[PDB]
Scaffold this active site. Sequence first.
Site, PDB file in Angstrom:
ATOM      1  CB  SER A  67      -3.277  -5.378   6.463  1.00 47.61           C
ATOM      2  OG  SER A  67      -3.804  -6.559   5.926  1.00 47.61           O
ATOM      3  CE  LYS A  91      -5.819  -2.350   7.217  1.00 45.98           C
ATOM      4  NZ  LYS A  91      -5.429  -3.240   8.332  1.00 45.98           N
ATOM      5  CB  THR A  92      -3.673  -3.201  12.293  1.00 48.55           C
ATOM      6  OG1 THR A  92      -4.727  -3.812  11.530  1.00 48.55           O
ATOM      7  CG2 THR A  92      -4.238  -2.593  13.588  1.00 48.55           C
ATOM      8  N   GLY A  93      -1.192  -3.561  10.615  1.00 49.67           N
ATOM      9  CA  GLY A  93      -0.452  -4.421   9.697  1.00 49.67           C
ATOM     10  C   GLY A  93       0.317  -5.422  10.532  1.00 49.67           C
TER      11      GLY A  93
END
Lengths: 245, 233
Positions: A48, A185-187
């Site tokens: 993501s 932002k996370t992933g």
Amino acid sequence: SSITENTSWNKEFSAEAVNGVFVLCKSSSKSCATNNLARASKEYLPASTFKIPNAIIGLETGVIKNEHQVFKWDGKPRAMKQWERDLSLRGAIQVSAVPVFQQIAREVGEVRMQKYLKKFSYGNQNISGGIDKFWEGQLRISAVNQVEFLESLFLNKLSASKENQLIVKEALVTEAAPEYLVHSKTGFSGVGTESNPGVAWWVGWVEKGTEVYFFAFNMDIDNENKLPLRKSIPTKIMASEGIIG
Amino acid sequence: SSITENTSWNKEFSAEAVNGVFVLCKSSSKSCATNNLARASKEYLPASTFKIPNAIIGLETGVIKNEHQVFKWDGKPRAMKQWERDLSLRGAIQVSAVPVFQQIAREVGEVRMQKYLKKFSYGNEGQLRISAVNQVEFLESLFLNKLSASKENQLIVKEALVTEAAPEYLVHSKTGFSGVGTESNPGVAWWVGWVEKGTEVYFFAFNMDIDNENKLPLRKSIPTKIMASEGII
């Protein structure tokens, strides 16, 4: 970029039995530091975190009209209860709405996608396996590349309108205090196996006073309950440097 | 605008012995609610809420170069410690850094400034006054990029105004306070901004009389309570 390896940070990783890297730059990518120079440059699936360039390209191609764009639910169920309603840009980005972004990717189309990612220098550049599924598939990017890319976004140097770069920068705000703004932002690619593990990301930058700090973190992960570590480890490191806590 | 008076928030003012107004609009100035219709339209000195048009005009005229502008301290003693350092745009806004915005206004010039304020319909210098309703209208225009300024510049100021981020919303806001005054002539304290909550937007303007400094915290706390009770934040 210019990058210095400091082993000291390794403590926070050891304490949690985490196999990972953190890259932190003050002011610019001419000034980065990391726990593991080799892992810093190794490419992983963006998951993501790929929502960032996807959003820029979406806006730039007109697929996303402006910052006020709503992502309407069509009634037909979505696979996550968090996506089953109307979403703003920021909202779609915060909850990582997979159908929202696949639809953006499908309308951008594979030729335009590839071209923008080339202009962006975004990773290895491979979008195979289908257009709605390459952040899960072949595309790979390193921690260093992520900070380089975010630095370009911060400075409005991506091949995109200043407006669209601003819009995306605001949607990525996740924490605000009087002295700083945190854009992040996370992933997470999934668990994978114990032998072959999934990857977890936290990437972003911190505007503190007149200073900026770019950051990118990743880790091997084989259990979802290890997921909060992707924020606590970078947060401890940045706290210790006196940045944020 | 379209503004409806309600008695539900009246207690919240009276419990604190406070004379003031809150104006709160859902989606647009076509749905504003207020505890006091008459005060909503009353014009007061904007104080540091004026730093919002000022920042836009600063950018429009190139006095503020872009969003990376550093406002460098010249070493001279200033009226607060927290102002005695280099400041970002966001920084100078959050601490209402008087000498910074005075320099911007100076470099912009009186006539230029005035021309932009008219274009913005910003109130009607020490002579300029604006109402809670006019605040919401001006903020709505800003939110919609409808002011006479580049979309870029409006974006830049909207982000410098962010004061709270949570996963469901973003609060953009600004304080202003002209200082304590005689009971004859009381000072006014302001909190204005908007909240982007999912796909929805809430505009707000609060102001209140203030003859004691110890009352200041109510300026944020009352509107926060009202908006929290309504589920906004």
